[PDB]
């Protein structure tokens with residue numbers, strides 16, 4: 504009926520404590536935003 | 552965006568009237584307080600004695 508209600512932080516996964524990696528990833532667009540949106544939708548779907 | 556949590560929610564939602572619910576705005580991280588380095592006792596002492 505339900506699987507693990509997981510969520511992944513795109514920025515922390517792609518880049519660690521380093522900031523320059525975060526800045527360089529920021530130019531790839533809204534990949535991380537929609538990526539987190541998909542997992543949030545999955546989590547709410549599991550609760551539903 | 553950085554004024555208050557509701558303002559961060561407004562920035563994340565890109566709206567001025569956030570509806571009733573729970574919204575994830577940012578990620579909390581604990582920056583390390585200090586750095587400690589530990590090494591074992593050195594035995595390769597120069598033969599000064």
Ligand SMILES: *[C@@H]1O[C@H](CO)[C@@H](O)[C@H](O)[C@H]1NC(C)=O
Pocket residue numbers: 599600
């Ligand atoms: C041998 O030399 C070291 C370094 O000066 C000294 O600390 C030690 O007391 C000496 N040994 C003796 C038996 O005095």
